[PDB]
Short mmCIF file of C-alpha atoms and ligand atoms in Angstrom, two decimals:
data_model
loop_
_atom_site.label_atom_id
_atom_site.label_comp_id
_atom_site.label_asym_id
_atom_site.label_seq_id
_atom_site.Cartn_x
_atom_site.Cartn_y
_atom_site.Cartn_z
CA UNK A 1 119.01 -79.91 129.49
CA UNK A 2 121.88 -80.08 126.88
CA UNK A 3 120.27 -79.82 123.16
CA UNK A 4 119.06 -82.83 121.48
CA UNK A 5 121.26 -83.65 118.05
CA UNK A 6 119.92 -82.80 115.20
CA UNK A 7 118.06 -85.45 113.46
CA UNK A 8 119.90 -86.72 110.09
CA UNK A 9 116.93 -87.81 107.20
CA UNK A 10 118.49 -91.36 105.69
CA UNK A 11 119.86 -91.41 102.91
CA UNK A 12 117.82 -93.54 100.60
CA UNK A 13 119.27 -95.44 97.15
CA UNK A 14 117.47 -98.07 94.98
CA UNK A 15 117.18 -101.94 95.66
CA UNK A 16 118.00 -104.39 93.02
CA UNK A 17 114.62 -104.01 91.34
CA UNK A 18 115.94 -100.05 91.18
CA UNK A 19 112.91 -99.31 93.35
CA UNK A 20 112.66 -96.94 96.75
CA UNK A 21 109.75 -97.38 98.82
CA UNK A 22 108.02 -94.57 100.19
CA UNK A 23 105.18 -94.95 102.74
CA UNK A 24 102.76 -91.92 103.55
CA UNK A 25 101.44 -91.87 107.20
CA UNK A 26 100.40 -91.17 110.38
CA UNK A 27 102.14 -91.40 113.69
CA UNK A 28 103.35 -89.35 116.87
CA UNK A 29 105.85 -86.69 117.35
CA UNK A 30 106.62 -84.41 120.78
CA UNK A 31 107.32 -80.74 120.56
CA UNK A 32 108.46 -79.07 124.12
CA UNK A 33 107.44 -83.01 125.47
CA UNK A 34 103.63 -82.78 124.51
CA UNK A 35 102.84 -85.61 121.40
CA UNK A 36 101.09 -84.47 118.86
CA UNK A 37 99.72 -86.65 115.42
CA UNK A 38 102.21 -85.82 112.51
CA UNK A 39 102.85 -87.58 109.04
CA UNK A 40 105.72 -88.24 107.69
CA UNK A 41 107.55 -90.35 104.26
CA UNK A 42 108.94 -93.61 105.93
CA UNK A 43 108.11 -92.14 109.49
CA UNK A 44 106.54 -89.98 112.18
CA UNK A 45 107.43 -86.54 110.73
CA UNK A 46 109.30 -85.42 107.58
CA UNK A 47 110.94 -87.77 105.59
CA UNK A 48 114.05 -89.18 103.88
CA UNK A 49 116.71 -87.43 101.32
CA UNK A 50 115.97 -89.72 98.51
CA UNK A 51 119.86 -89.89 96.52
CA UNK A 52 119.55 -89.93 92.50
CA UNK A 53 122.01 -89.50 89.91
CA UNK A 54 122.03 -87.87 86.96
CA UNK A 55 121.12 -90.33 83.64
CA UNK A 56 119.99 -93.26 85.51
CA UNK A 57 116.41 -93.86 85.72
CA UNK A 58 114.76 -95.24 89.22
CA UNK A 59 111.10 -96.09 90.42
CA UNK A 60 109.41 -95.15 93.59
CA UNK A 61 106.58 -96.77 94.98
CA UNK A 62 104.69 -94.63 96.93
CA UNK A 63 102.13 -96.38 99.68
CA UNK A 64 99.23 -93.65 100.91
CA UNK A 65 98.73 -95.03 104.59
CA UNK A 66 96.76 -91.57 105.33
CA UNK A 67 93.11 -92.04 105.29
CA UNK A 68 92.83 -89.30 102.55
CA UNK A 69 93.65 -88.49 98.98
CA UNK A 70 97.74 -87.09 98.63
CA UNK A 71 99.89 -86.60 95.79
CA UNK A 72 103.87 -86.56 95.60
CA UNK A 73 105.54 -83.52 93.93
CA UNK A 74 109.28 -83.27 93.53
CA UNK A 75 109.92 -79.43 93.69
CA UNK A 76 112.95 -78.84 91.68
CA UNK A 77 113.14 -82.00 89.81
CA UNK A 78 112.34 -81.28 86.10
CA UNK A 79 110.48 -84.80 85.07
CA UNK A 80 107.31 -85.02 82.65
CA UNK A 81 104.04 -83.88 83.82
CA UNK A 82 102.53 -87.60 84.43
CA UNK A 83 105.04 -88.38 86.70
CA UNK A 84 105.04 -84.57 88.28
CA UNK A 85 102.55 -85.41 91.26
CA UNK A 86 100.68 -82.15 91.06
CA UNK A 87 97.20 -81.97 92.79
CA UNK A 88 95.96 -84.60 89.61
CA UNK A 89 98.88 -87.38 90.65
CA UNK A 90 96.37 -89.00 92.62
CA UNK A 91 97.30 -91.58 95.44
CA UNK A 92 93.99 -93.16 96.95
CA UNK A 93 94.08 -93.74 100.66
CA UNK A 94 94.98 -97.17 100.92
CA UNK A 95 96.75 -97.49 97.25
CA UNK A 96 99.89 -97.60 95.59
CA UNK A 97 101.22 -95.06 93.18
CA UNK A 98 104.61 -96.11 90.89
CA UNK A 99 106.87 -93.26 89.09
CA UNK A 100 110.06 -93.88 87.20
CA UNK A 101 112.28 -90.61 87.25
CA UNK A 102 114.57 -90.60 84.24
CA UNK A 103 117.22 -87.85 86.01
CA UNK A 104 118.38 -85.08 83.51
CA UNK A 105 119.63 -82.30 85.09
CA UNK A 106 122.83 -80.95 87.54
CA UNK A 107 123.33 -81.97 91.01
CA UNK A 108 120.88 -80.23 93.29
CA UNK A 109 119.13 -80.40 96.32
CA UNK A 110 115.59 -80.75 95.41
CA UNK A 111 112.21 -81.66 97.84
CA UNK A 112 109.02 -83.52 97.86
CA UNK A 113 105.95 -82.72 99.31
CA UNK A 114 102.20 -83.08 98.81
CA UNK A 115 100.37 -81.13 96.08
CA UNK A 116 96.67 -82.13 96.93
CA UNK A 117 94.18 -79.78 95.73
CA UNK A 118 93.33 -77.54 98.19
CA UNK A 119 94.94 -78.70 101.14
CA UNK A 120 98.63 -78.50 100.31
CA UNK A 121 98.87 -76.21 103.30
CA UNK A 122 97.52 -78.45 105.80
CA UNK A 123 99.54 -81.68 104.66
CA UNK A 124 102.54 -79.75 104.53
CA UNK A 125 101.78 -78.70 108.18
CA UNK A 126 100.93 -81.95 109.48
CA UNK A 127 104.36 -83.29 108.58
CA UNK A 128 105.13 -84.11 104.97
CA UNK A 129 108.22 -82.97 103.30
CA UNK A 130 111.46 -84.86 102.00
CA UNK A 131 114.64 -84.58 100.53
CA UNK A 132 116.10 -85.23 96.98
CA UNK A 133 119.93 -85.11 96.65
CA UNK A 134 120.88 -85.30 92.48
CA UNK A 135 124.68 -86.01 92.29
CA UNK A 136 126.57 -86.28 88.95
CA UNK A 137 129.71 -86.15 87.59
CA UNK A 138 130.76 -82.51 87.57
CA UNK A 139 130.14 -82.49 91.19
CA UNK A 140 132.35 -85.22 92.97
CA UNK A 141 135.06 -83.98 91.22
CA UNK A 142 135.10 -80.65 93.45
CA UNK A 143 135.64 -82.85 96.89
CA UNK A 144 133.21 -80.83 98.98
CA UNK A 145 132.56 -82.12 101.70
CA UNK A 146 130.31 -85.25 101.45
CA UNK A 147 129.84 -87.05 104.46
CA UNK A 148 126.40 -87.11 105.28
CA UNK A 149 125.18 -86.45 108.48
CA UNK A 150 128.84 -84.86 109.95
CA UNK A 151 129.62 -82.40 107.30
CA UNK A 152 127.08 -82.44 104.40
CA UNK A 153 124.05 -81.87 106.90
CA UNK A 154 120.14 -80.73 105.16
CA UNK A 155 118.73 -77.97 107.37
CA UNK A 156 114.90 -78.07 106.90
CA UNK A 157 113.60 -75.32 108.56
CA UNK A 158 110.19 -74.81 109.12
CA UNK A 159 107.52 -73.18 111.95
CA UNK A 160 104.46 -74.64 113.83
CA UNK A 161 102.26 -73.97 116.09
CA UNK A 162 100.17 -75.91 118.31
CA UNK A 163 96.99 -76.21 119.96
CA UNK A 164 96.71 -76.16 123.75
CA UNK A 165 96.44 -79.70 124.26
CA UNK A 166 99.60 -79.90 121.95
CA UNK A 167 98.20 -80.65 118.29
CA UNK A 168 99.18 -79.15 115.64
CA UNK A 169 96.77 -76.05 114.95
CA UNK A 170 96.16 -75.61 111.09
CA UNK A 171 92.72 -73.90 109.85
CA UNK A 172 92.32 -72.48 106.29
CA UNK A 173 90.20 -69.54 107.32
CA UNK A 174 89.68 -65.58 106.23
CA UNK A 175 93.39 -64.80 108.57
CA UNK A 176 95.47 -67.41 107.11
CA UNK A 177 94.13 -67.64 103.41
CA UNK A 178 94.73 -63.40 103.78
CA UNK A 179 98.65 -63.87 105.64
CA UNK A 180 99.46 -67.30 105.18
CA UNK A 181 100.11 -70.16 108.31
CA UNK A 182 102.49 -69.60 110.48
CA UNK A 183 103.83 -70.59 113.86
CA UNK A 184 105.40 -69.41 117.25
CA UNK A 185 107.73 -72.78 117.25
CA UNK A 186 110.70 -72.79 115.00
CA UNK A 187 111.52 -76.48 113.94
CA UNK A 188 115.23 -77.35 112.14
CA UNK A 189 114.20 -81.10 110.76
CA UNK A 190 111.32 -81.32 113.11
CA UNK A 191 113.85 -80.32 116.50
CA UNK A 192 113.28 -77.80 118.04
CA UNK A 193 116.87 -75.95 118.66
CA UNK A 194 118.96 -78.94 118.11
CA UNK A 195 122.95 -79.03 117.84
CA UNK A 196 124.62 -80.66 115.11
CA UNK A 197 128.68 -82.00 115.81
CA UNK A 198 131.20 -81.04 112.90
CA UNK A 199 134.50 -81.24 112.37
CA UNK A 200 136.99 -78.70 111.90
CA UNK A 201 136.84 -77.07 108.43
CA UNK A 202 134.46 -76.35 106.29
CA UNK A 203 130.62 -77.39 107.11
CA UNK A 204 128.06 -77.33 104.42
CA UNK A 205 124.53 -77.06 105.10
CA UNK A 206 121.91 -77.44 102.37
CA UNK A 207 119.83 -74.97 103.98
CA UNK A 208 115.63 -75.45 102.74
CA UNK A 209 112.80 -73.05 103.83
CA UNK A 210 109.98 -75.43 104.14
CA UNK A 211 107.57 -73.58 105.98
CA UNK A 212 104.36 -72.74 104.46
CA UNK A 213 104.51 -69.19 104.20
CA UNK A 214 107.08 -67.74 106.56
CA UNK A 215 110.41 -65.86 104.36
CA UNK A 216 113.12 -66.72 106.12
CA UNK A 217 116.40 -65.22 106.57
CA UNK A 218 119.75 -67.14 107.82
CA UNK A 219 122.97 -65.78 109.49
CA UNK A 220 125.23 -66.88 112.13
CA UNK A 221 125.28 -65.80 115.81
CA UNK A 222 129.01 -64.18 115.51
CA UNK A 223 128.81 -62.95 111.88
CA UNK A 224 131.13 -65.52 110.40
CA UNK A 225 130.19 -65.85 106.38
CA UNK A 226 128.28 -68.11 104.67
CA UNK A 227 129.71 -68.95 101.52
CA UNK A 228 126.82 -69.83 99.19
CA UNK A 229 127.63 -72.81 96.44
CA UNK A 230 124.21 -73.57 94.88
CA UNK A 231 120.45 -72.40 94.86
CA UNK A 232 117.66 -74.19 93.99
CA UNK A 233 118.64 -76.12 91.20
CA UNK A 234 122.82 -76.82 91.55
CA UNK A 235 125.99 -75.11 91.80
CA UNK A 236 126.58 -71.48 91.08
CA UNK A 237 130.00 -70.81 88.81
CA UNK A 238 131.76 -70.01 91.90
CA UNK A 239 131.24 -69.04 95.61
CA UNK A 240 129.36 -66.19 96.74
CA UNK A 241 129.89 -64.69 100.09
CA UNK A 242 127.42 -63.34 102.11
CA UNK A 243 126.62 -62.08 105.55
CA UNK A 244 123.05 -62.87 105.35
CA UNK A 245 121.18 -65.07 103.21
CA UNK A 246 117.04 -64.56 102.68
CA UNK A 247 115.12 -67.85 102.03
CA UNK A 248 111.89 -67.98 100.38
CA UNK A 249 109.06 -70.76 101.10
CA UNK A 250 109.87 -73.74 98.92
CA UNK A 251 114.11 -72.84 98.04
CA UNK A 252 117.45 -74.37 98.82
CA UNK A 253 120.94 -73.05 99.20
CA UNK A 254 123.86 -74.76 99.59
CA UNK A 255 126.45 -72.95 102.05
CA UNK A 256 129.33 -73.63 103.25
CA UNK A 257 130.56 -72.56 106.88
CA UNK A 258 134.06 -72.49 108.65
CA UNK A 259 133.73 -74.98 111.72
CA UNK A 260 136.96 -73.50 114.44
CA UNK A 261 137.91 -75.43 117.71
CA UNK A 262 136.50 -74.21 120.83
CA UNK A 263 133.97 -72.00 119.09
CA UNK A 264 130.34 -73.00 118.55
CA UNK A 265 128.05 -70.99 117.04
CA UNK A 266 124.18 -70.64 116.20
CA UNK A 267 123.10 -70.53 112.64
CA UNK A 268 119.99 -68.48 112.87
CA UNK A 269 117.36 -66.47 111.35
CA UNK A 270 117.15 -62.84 111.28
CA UNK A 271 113.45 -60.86 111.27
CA UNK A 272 112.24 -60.25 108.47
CA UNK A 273 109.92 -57.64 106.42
CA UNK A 274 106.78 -59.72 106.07
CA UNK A 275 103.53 -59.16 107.30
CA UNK A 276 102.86 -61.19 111.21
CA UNK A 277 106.35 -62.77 110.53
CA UNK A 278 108.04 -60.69 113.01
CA UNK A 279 105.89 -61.64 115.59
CA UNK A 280 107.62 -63.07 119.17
CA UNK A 281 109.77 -64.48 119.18
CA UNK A 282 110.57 -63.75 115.98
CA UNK A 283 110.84 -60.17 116.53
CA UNK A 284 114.44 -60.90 116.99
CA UNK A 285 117.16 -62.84 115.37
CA UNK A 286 116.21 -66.61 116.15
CA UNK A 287 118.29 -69.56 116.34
CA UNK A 288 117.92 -72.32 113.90
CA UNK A 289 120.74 -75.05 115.25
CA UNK A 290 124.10 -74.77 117.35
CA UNK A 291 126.97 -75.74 115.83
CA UNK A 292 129.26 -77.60 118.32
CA UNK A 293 132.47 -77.99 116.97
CA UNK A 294 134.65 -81.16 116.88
CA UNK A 295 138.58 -81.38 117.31
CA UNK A 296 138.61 -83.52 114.72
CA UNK A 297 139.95 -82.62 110.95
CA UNK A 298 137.02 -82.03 108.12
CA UNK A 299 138.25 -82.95 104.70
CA UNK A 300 136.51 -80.85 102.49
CA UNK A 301 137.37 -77.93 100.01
CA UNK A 302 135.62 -75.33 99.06
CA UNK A 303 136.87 -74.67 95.25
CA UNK A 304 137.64 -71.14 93.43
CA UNK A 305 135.45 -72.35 90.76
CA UNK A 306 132.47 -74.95 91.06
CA UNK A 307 130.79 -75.15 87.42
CA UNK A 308 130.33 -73.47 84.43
CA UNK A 309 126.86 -71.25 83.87
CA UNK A 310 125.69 -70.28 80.65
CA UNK A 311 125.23 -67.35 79.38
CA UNK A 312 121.41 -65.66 79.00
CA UNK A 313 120.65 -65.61 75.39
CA UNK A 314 119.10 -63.03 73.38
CA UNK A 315 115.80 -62.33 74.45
CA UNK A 316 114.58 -60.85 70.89
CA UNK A 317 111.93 -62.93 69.44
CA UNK A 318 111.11 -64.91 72.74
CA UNK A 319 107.69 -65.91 73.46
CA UNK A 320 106.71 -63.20 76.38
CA UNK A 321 103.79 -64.35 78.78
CA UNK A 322 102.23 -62.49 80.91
CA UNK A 323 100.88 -63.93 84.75
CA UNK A 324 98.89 -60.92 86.69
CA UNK A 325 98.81 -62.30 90.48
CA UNK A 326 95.96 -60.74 92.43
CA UNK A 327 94.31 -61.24 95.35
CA UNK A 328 90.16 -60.16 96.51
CA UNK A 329 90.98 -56.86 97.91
CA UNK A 330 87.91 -57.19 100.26
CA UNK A 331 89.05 -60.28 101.92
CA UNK A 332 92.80 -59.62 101.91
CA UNK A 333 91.82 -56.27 104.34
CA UNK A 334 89.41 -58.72 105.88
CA UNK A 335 92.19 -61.29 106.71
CA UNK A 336 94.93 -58.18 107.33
CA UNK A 337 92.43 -56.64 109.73
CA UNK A 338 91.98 -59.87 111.96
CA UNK A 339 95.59 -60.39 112.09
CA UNK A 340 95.93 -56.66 113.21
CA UNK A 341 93.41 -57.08 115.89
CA UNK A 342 94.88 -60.53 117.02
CA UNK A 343 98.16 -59.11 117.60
CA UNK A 344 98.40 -55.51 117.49
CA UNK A 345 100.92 -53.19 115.42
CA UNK A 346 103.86 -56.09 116.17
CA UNK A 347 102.13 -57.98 113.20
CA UNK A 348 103.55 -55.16 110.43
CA UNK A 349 107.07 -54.08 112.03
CA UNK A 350 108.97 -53.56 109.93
CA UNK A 351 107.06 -52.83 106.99
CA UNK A 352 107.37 -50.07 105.33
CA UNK A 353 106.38 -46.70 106.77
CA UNK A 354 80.23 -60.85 108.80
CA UNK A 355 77.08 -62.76 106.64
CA UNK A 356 76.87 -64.97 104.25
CA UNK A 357 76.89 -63.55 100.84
CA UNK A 358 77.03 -66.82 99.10
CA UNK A 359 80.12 -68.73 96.54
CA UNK A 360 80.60 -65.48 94.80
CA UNK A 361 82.53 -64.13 98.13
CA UNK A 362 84.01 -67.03 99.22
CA UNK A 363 87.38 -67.23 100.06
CA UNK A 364 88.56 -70.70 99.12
CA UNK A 365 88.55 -69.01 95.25
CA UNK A 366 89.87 -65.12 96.26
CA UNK A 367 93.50 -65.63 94.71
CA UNK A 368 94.10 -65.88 91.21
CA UNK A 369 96.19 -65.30 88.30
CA UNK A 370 95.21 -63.50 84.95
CA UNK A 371 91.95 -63.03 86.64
CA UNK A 372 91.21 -66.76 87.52
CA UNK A 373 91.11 -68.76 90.32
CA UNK A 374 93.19 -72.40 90.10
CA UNK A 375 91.00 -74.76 87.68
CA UNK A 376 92.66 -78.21 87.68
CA UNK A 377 90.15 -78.63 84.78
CA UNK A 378 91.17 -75.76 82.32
CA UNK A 379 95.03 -75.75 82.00
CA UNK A 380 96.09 -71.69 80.90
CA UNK A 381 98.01 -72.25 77.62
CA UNK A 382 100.35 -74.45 76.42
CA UNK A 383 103.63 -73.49 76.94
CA UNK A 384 106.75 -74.58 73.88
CA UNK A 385 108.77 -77.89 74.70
CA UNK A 386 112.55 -77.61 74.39
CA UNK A 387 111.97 -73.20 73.74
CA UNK A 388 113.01 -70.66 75.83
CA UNK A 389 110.05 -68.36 76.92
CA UNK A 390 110.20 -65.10 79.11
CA UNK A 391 107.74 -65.14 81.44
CA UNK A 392 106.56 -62.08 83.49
CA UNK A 393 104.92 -62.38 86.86
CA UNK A 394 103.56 -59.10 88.44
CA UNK A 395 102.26 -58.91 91.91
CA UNK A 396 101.58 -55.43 91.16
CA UNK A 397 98.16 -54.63 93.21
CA UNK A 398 98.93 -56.08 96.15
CA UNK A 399 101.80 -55.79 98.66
CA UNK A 400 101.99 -59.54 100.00
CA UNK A 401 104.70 -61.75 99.29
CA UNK A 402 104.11 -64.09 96.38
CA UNK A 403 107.59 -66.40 96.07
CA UNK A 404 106.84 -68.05 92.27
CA UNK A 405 107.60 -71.29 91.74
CA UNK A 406 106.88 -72.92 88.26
CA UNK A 407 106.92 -76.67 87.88
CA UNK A 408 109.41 -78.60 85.64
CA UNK A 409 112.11 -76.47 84.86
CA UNK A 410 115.15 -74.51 86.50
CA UNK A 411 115.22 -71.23 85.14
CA UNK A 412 117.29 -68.21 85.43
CA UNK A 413 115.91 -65.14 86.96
CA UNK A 414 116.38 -61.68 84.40
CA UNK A 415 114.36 -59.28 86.96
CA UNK A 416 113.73 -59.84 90.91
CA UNK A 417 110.32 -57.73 91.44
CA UNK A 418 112.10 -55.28 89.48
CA UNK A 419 115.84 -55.25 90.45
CA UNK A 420 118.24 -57.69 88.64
CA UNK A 421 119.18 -60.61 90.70
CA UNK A 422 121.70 -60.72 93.62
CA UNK A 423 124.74 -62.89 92.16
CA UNK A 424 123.98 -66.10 94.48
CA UNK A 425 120.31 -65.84 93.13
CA UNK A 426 121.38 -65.46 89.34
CA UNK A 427 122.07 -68.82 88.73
CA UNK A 428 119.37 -72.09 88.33
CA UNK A 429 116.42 -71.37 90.20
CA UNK A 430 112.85 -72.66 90.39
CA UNK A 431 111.30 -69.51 92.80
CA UNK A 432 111.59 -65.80 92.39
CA UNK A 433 110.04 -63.20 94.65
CA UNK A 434 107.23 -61.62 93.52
CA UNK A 435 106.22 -58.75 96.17
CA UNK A 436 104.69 -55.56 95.25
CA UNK A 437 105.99 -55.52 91.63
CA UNK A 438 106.95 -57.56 88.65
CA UNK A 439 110.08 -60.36 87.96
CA UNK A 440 110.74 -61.73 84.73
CA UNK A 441 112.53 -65.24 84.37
CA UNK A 442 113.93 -66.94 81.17
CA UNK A 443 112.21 -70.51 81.19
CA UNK A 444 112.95 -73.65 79.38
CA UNK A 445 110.84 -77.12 79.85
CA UNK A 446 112.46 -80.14 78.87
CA UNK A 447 109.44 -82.55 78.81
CA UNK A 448 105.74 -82.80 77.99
CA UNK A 449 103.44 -81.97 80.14
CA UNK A 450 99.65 -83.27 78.94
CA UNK A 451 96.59 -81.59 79.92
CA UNK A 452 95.47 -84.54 82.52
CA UNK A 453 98.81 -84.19 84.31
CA UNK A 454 99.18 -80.40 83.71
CA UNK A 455 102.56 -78.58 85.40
CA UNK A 456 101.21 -76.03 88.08
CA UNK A 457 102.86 -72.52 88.58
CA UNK A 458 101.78 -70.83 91.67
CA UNK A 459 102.50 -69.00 94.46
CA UNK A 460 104.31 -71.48 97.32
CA UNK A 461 102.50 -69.06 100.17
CA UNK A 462 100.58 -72.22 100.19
CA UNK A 463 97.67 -70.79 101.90
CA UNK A 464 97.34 -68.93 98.57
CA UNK A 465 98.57 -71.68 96.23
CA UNK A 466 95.45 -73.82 98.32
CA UNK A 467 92.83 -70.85 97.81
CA UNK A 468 93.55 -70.14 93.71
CA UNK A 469 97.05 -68.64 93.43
CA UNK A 470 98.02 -71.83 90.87
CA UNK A 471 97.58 -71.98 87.49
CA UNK A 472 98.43 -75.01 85.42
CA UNK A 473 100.06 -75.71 81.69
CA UNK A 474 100.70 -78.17 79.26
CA UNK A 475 103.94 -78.53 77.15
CA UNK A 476 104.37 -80.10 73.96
CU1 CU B 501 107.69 -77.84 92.07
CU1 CU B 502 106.74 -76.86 95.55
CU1 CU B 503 104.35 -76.94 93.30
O1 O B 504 106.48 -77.42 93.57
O1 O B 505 104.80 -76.68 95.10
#
């Protein structure tokens, strides 16, 4: 059978009230032609790329159609902490939530997903995740390409796996709180293996890793280039050219890619050094999407120059805080162990060379930073509005990988777990790896954040964000 297409989110814009609609629920999907219950924003599975621009305000009604409690985050999007949708932006099952987003930061490609407490993982899993696309001024100006769906395509990229009677199979248990959920079935916007049709020219793809605690790491199948233009939150100063570009859970790139007559080519991902990720099939380099290329002219540049990035600032006199990761040593060898036995030395290459003892051992709390687990009830501190702070985040105790995301604000990354950044990660981001050692980042929150609608920082290995591996803050 010839690959399906590759399925194109919509493109969503406000109505004359200014309002987008989004509807939470439950439906069908088939994987590998078995149908399995999903959710989705506005359908089955996944969502829509909702389209904002920078200085105008708009409102989104959000309609929970599941039969639980869900919230709506918008990772990447810097907005105040009441209208942040962490795990207290409660939607009922059955209600209506409204948020007005008053835009105020570069084009980016940005997300939304669930932030329930607790069960981030799972909702994530079953299906939810969208799209935000922030346009501005700056941006049109560079003519990249723009024409959704042919050549200005999002890549969401995320594993499953399934049950035998084709379900999807998510548990929360000792394995998965220890390694995180993951999946023998790679999915590129919910197809599996799908081919996308561009023209001739430049391609871009804004690539996100939305699985829920798989690293990813994209290439192409005949080692053309990927020119990277922007990270998590907008455009870099200029291109950066790579041959291989690492993904952690929860980031976007923007890349562009030559499209040449005659030639397709896979965009896929290469193994990587994470604990069970390089399980079969990922043992080997793993194709995301075929490009099929189209005799037909693609219009877009790819500029010298694409915007203009500050300059870090002194760091004397900053505010300096200090987040210890850890994990319960007991059950991370407990949950290491069982993946070990499951499936053998395969679940570390390429690493480096049973009773009930009551709440004090449970899991559901074993992650934590500066020695507590997430308590949506006692926010850590209370961070400076409109300050820079320089926040260091040390996974050092532990070897898993800890990608640390930290609600409303882009910041700029001084220290990667210890090295300074690679140039295409040096410019706005809202993750930095955090695996073995410590990173530093240079922080800056633009709104308040109150201490009933607290910003979260966490770990997005959502099995850990879900079992303590949060913290939350106020500002102002
Ligand atoms: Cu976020
Ligand atoms: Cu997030
Ligand atoms: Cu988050
Ligand atoms: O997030
Ligand atoms: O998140």
């Amino acid at each position: 059978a010839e690959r399906p297409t590759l399925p194109i989110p919509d493109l969503l814009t406000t109505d004359a009230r200014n309002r987008i609609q989004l509807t939470i629920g439950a439906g069908q999907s088939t994987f590998g032609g078995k149908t399995a219950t999903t959710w989705g924003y506005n359908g089955n599975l996944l969502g829509p790329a909702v389209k904002l621009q920078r200085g105008k305000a708009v409102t989104v009604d959000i309609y929970n159609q599941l039969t639980e409690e869900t919230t709506l985050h918008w990772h990447g999007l810097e907005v105040p902490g009441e209208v942040d949708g962490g795990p207290q932006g409660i939607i009922p099952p059955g209600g209506k939530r409204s948020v007005t987003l008053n835009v105020d930061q570069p084009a980016a490609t940005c997300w939304f997903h669930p932030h329930q407490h607790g069960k981030t993982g799972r909702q994530v899993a079953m299906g939810l995740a969208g799209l935000v696309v922030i346009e501005d001024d700056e941006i049109l100006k560079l003519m990249l390409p723009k024409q959704w769906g042919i050549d200005d395509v999002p890549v969401i990229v995320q594993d499953k796996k399934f049950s035998a009677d084709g379900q999807i199979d998510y548990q929360l248990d000792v394995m998965t709180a220890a390694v995180g959920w993951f999946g023998d079935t790679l999915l590129t916007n919910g197809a599996i293996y799908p081919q996308h049709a561009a023209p001739r020219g430049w391609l871009r793809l804004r690539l996100l890793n939305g699985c829920n605690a798989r690293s990813l790491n994209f290439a192409t199948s005949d080692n053309r280039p990927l020119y990277v233009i922007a990270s998590d939150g907008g455009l870099l100063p200029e291109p950066v050219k790579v041959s291989e570009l690492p993904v952690l859970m929860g980031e976007r790139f923007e890349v562009l890619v030559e499209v040449n007559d005659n030639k397709p080519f896979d965009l896929v991902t290469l193994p990587v050094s994470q604990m069970g990720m390089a399980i079969a099939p990922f043992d080997k380099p793993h194709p995301v999407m075929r490009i099929q290329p189209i005799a037909i002219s693609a219009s877009g540049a790819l500029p010298d120059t694409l915007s203009s990035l500050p300059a870090l600032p002194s760091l004397e006199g900053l505010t300096v805080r200090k987040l210890q990761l850890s994990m319960d040593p007991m059950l991370d060898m407990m949950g290491m162990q069982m993946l070990m036995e499951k499936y053998g030395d395969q679940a570390m290459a390429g690493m480096d060379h049973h009773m009930n003892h009551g709440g004090k051992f449970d899991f559901h709390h074993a992650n934590k930073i500066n020695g507590q687990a997430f308590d949506m009830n006692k926010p850590m501190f209370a961070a400076a509005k409109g300050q820079y702070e320089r926040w260091v985040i040390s996974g050092v105790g532990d070897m898993m990988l800890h990608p640390f995301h930290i609600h409303g604000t882009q910041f700029r990354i001084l220290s990667e777990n210890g090295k300074p950044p690679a140039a295409h990660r040096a410019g706005w981001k809202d993750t930095v790896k955090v695996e073995g050692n410590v990173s530093e980042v240079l922080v800056k929150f633009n709104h308040d954040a109150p201490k009933e609608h607290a910003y979260m920082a966490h770990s997005h290995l959502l099995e850990h964000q879900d079992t303590g591996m949060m913290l939350g803050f106020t500002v102002g």
